[PDB]
Design an enzyme around this catalytic site. Structure first.
Site, PDB file in Angstrom:
ATOM      1  N   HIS A   1       0.823  -1.235   0.000  1.00 37.39           N
ATOM      2  CA  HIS A   1       0.000   0.000   0.000  1.00 37.39           C
ATOM      3  C   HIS A   1       0.852   1.280   0.000  1.00 37.39           C
ATOM      4  CE1 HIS A   1       0.263  -0.518   4.387  1.00 37.39           C
ATOM      5  NE2 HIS A   1       0.252   0.799   4.389  1.00 37.39           N
TER       6      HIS A   1
ATOM      7  N   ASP B   1       0.451  -7.908   1.375  1.00 37.94           N
ATOM      8  CA  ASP B   1       0.814  -6.472   1.569  1.00 37.94           C
ATOM      9  C   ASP B   1       2.337  -6.323   1.557  1.00 37.94           C
ATOM     10  OD1 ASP B   1       0.147  -3.744   1.644  1.00 37.94           O
ATOM     11  OD2 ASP B   1       0.172  -3.735   3.820  1.00 37.94           O
TER      12      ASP B   1
ATOM     13  N   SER C   1       4.869   2.216   9.103  1.00 36.36           N
ATOM     14  CA  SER C   1       4.308   1.290   8.089  1.00 36.36           C
ATOM     15  C   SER C   1       5.367   0.997   7.020  1.00 36.36           C
ATOM     16  CB  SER C   1       3.035   1.766   7.497  1.00 36.36           C
ATOM     17  OG  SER C   1       2.517   0.850   6.566  1.00 36.36           O
TER      18      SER C   1
END
Length: 296
Positions: free
Chosen positions: A45, A81, A162
């Site tokens: 992402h 991911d 992240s």
């Protein structure tokens, strides 16, 4: 110096900023140096919008010293991911020490390391809360929602760490931070990165089933909401209304564990599926297809 200050400072050179800018856009995330040739692991992402619009997006890598260098997409996986980038001819690279997510225990103290130079960079402290926890993840761009078997942590996982590594007290990576905090285990990352470096793509098993979560006495698991025509499910005898309670050698508590259990199945190898049909327990046989046929 402090116990946590030492570990976070030892891994800062292996953590990088990833900026994907455009005329009217500017995503940013964190990554980790996993190979001296310029191989960097981040999440899908962080770079999803860029990979989907490579004409208008430019991605770069900002190191700990501050060197901004152009980066190239090696390969991405919306299912785990995960994503790989490559920086060319960059020397003196500080490569992260990859640990074993199989030896990780509940209560293990961890640091969720963000890139030291990132805009809203964060370094968080916590412990391992849960091992092998099925967790749903939202798809950034036109990417599909998935579920992963994650390491859960009470350390805050946010926009600032992240993509960054989840580090143990030995300054070793045991996971990649996601987007009540979760990380993709490193053992799964090493498998996905290996296929994404070599083939630019990972092939995952598919069965053609949509499930909804059910917990009612005998019917506790994943209820078949839809079957795809011609699916290995249809060939296997799988029906709607059916409650999947075991996929392979793995029990299915809900839709989340089903998605993960299907991806641990072998491609082209016959596999047991156990369902609860109209009150009756029934075992069905299914052979898993490749999600990407021309790439298997």
């Amino acid at each position: 110096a402090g116990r946590f200050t030492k570990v976070a400072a030892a891994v800062a050179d292996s953590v990088v900023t990833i900026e994907s800018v455009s005329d009217q856009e500017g995503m940013q995330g964190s990554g980790v140096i996993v190979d001296g040739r310029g191989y960097i692991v981040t999440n899908n992402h962080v770079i999803s919008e860029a990979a989907n619009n490579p004409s208008q997006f430019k991605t770069t890598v900002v190191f700990n010293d501050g060197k901004e260098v152009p980066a190239n997409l090696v390969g991405r996986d919306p299912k785990t991911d995960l994503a790989v980038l490559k920086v060319d001819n960059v020397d003196n690279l500080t490569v992260a020490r990859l640990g074993d997510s199989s030896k990780v225990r509940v209560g293990d103290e961890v640091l969720a390391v963000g890139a030291p130079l990132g805009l809203r960079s964060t370094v968080t402290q916590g412990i391992v809360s849960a091992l092998h926890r099925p967790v749903p993840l939202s798809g950034e761009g036109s990417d599909t929602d998935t579920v992963i078997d994650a390491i859960q942590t009470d350390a805050s996982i946010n926009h600032g760490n992240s993509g960054g590594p989840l580090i143990d007290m030995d300054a070793q990576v045991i996971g990649i931070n996601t987007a009540l905090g979760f990380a993709i285990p490193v053992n799964e990352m090493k498998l996905v990165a290996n296929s994404l470096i070599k083939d630019g793509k990972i092939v995952h098993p598919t069965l053609g089933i949509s499930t909804r979560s059910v917990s009612n006495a005998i019917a506790s698991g994943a209820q078949v909401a839809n079957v795809k025509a011609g699916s290995p499910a249809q060939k296997g005898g799988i029906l709607e209304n059916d409650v999947i309670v075991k996929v392979g050698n793995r029990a299915v508590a809900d839709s989340d564990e089903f998605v993960v259990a299907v991806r641990q199945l072998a491609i082209g190898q016959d596999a047991p599926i156990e369902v609860v049909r109209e009150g009756r327990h029934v075992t069905l046989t299914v052979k898993p297809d490749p999600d990407s046929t021309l790439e298997h």
